[PDB]
Amino acid sequence: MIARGKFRSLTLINWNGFFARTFDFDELVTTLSGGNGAGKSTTMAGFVTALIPDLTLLNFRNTTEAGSTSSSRDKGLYGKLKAGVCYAVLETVNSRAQRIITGVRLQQIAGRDKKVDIRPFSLQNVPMTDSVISLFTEQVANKARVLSLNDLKEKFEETAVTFKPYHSITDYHSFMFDLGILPKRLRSSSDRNKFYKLIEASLYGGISSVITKSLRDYLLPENSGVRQAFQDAESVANILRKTIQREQNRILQLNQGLQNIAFGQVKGVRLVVNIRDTHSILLNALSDQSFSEALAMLYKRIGEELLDYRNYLDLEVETLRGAYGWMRAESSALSTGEAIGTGMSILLMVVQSWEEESRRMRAKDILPCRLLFLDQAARLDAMSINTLFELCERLDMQLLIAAPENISPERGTTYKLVRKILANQEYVHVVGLKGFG
Amino acid sequence: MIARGKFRSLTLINWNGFFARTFDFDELVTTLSGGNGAGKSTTMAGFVTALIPDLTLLNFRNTTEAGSTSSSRDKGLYGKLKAGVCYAVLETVNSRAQRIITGVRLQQIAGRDKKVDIRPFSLQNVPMTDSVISLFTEQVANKARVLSLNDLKEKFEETAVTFKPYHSITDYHSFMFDLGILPKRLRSSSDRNKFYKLIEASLYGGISSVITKSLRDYLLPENSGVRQAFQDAESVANILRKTIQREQNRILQLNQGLQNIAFGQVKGVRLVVNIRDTHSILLNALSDQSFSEALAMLYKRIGEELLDYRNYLDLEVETLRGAYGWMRAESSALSTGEAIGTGMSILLMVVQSWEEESRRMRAKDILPCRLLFLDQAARLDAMSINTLFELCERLDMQLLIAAPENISPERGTTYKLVRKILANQEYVHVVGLKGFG
Amino acid sequence: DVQTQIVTAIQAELAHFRNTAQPINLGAVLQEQLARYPQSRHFDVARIIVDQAVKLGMASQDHQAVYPVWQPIDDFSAAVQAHLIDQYDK
Amino acid sequence: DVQTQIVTAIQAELAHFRNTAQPINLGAVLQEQLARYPQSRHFDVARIIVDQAVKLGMASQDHQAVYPVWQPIDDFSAAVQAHLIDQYDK
Numbered sequence A, B: 001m002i003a004r005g006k007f008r009s010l011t012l013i014n015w016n017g018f019f020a021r022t023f024d025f026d027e028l029v030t031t032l033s034g035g036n037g038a039g040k041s042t043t044m045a046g047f048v049t050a051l052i053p054d055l056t057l058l059n060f061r062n063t064t065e066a067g068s069t070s071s072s073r074d075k076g077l078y079g080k081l082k083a084g085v086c087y088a089v090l091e092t093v094n095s096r097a098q099r100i101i102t103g104v105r106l107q108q109i110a111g112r113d114k115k116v117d118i119r120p121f122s123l124q125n126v127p128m129t130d131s132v133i134s135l136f137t138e139q140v141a142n143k144a145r146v147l148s149l150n151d152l153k154e155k156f157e158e159t160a161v162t163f164k165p166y167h168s169i170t171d172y173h174s175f176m177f178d179l180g181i182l183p184k185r186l187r188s189s190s191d192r193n194k195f196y197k198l199i200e201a202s203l204y205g206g207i208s209s210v211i212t213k214s215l216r217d218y219l220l221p222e223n224s225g226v227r228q229a230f231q232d233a234e235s236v237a238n239i240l241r242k243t244i245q246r247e248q249n250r251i252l253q254l255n256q257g258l259q260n261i262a263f264g265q266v267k268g269v270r271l272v273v274n275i276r277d278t279h280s281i282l283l284n285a286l287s288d289q290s291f292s293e294a295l296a297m298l299y300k301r302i303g304e305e306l307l308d309y310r311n312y313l314d315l316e317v318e319t320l321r322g323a324y325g326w327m328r329a330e331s332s333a334l335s336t337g338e339a340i341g342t343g344m345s346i347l348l349m350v351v352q353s354w355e356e357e358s359r360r361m362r363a364k365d366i367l368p369c370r371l372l373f374l375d376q377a378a379r380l381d382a383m384s385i386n387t388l389f390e391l392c393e394r395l396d397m398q399l400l401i402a403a404p405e406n407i408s409p410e411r412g413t414t415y416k417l418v419r420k421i422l423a424n425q426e427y428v429h430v431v432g433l434k435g436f437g
Numbered sequence C, D: 001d002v003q004t005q006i007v008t009a010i011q012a013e014l015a016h017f018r019n020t021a022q023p024i025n026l027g028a029v030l031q032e033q034l035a036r037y038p039q040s041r042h043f044d045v046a047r048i049i050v051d052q053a054v055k056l057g058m059a060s061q062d063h064q065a066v067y068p069v070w071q072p073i074d075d076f077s078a079a080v081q082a083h084l085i086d087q088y089d090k
């Protein structure tokens, strides 16, 4: 019984209203309570930021503005930071009980504009006792000091600890992928786009349109062999099908862990596998009727893109209301609660899908971490909130939910934020609780 | 002490999951409780629908998708309706205690597509005793029946009651404007756009970008005389200023009822009146240095659009955080709670602004109704929710808030919705409460 | 207050009507109930009796296009706009 | 349960420390408090004592870049990760 990787803590350093702060994530559900403006989102913010230090994607619109295509407006992180050196560190414990530490050094550039400077890094082999805060801060003249990257280097040069500041984000992820934290391999900005896009869709909650539009990009895996075992008549048509079915069978399983759902009037969510009517005929020709060039003609009659099976399929999400049975998931026709509980579900399939698609390129004693968000949870009714919890328990997943409310769940850890004022500065007073239940 | 006009009830007939239903609005705050998918929004939906039966604007995106520019996707009302004849009726009691009734007859067109048919109408002089439901429904063979418009006509032909089915929406509003319900005169689709746009911005909550962008369209009144008393040297420049100031003074007052605010870390919201730097010089020329043609040159040196003072001003909203004092309102930099509590505030100014700009074209014993929404109220913390309530009490305003929560306020009327299933159809079981406190 | 004790205690009083044939007249029921507790938690108690009553079935004449009338209680301003819970559902 | 009685009763016990110079050690305080009530509403009670304690001031060493350690209570799994509430604010 392999132990799965979990996220253990989030520490923001010098973050606005948070000088040095650690948030211990529960083994299952962690809730941030507090009032409007408390700082619960800038927490979930920093988290993301470290998880994906890409200033090209990182964009925190206000929730009141979700489906916004706005690409000009302010990205919104610069302001959650304080002047000077700032940190965002994540602490993960491997399937091999390996305490790994991956963060970013956030620094607002020379107070001219509102642009931020980021630099990914990693710490390795830190003792399970030493606090994550202690690593990034000193004590100079009885005053606390945030040391910089070059100062960390020194500090850990003649040590077992291994500080590796990455030059390319590409390597930062390539790292988290090996020590088994990420479920996927973010080899490119095309791969990053999707990763973030998904995260974005769980923070804000609901049915992602970008994901729906191109569902067979977040689901259908690229079988590294249908091309290889090819380049090296109907044989193709058969293998294409003996592949489409194999996948269908695969999805057909995910679809099972979402039949007894409960969000609003939605009692279930499927992934319907439809075959494009066009390629539907092509597959008929190669059966009952230079090669890439061949298909090229057949397609026309009625290139290597017809060798990629995912280009034949056509996914489509569906919801189960006690009325018209299985209808295609549609925002316009769903309440906010079901809207959230539907997308959150799609999301689960994408994660399960990615993670399994990676068992190859990964060790065999490593199962990535899995954590999803839920900002403005009050939107869900207790009945719906239970379906999320029980679903996450089953898929063995970590949750971090923001309750604009001051009544959290009793399952898991609860952090209470209260933004106060001292020395005329923003100072968030945090207090966690856990164990009750 | 003039009594102000209030909305007394909303009745949906044949609406999905609501065959015949009346919602009594409180004199101040009315809360719809229920779980995800309960039907609280389709209620607020129908309301809007009747308030503005324009299928060109009416568009109910899911809240999870707010800042969406999507103009193609499904408008979302068709599905809240049932087959056949449907109604949406509003009951208002005048400043002259006149019970007026304005609604719309919603009817999904010949089940081919997803298009809806609407027809505005009004009933007048109905006795304060007769139920609003009874007017639109019969009893045929011990079975209830929804009569149609032509059937209502008959029914009220040889009666004092006055049923007037409007052909042009333009007249429908022209009516509500006279009997004093609307705060403005919706003479054109340009006027409608804005009205709806505002309503849209309170249902979804937060800072409207469309409104902000062109704030001096929802605030600066068109003084019907600066042109008239003109067409009939520095005299202009003086009157322009003796007008800009007059308005500034006007706004300067609204700005006062929002200094002791409390939304998140926002303690106040102003309307800052800035003068465009360009026209700023032009006003200097006409002072210390065929007519429309004249200014035309002056502008160039450094048409009748320079006679409209609102074209000189340049509004800009500001929020007061205990940190940088007065900063320009910006989503990116505000939490969701303050985001909502800020826009809601701007909104109040627009309403006050419109209503007063209409005292002329209106009687002198008529003060329009004033009601604002708040969907997904749980977003606000109790502290913030109090600032809304106390603000509305002061401006003497009606509120209708949707609580995805099952804990409403104790101030006002509370309607509890519970969507059940009978004869395999959607049936919402409503139960109101009030008086406790 | 929202004690699980009371809630169960309440389902007992309400389920009573479920037993017989006596539908639920939240107006009469609330009127009697709230008289047992001080205005301390009238709103809270009322709310419970309203959600509980709603579980044990629905109202017939609700689907008759017949408007329900606000039935006051107390020697004050309390009202309940609800039909009679006819048809119970097991 | 969330009785206004208790809450006031609580502010009394906590305000006690506000009086003297004795900062608030939510761990010690919770440990003693929760022992008075049955696990009936430990979570509810705890929460109150946490929000109340937070009103009466803040923690000094909180701004020292010193990580707070989860201090368990009960002969079970209860923990409180909070510093000592040093500096009170009138």
Ligand SMILES: Nc1ncnc2c1ncn2[C@@H]1O[C@H](COP(=O)(O)OP(=O)(O)OP(O)(O)=S)[C@@H](O)[C@H]1O
Pocket (backbone or CB within 6 Å): A034, A035, A036, A037, A038, A039, A040, A041, A042, A043, A076, A077, A078, A079, A080, A403, A404, B264, B265, B266, B321, B332, B333, B334, B335, B336, B337, B338, B379
């Ligand atoms: N880019 C920014 N620049 C300056 N201040 C910011 C910025 N982003 C957020 N804030 C401030 O931080 C506070 C909001 O913190 P958040 O973490 O969004 O709070 P919140 O607790 O999530 O509040 P909700 O969502 O309204 S319940 C506000 O009071 C803002 O003044």
Ligand SMILES: Nc1ncnc2c1ncn2[C@@H]1O[C@H](COP(=O)(O)OP(=O)(O)OP(O)(O)=S)[C@@H](O)[C@H]1O
Pocket (backbone or CB within 6 Å): A264, A265, A266, A321, A332, A333, A334, A335, A336, A337, A338, A379, B034, B035, B036, B037, B038, B039, B040, B041, B042, B043, B076, B077, B078, B079, B080, B403, B404
């Ligand atoms: N255009 C539509 N077509 C079909 N069903 C719809 C449509 N719009 C809404 N619904 C249904 O009505 C229910 C939602 O009703 P709403 O009035 O949005 O509920 P709600 O109580 O506001 O729920 P929240 O916002 O999630 S708390 C859902 O369960 C949908 O199945």
Ligand SMILES: [Mg+2]
Pocket (backbone or CB within 6 Å): A334, A335, A336, A337, B040, B041, B042
């Ligand atoms: Mg809704």
Ligand SMILES: [Mg+2]
Pocket (backbone or CB within 6 Å): A040, A041, A042, B334, B335, B336, B337
């Ligand atoms: Mg926020």
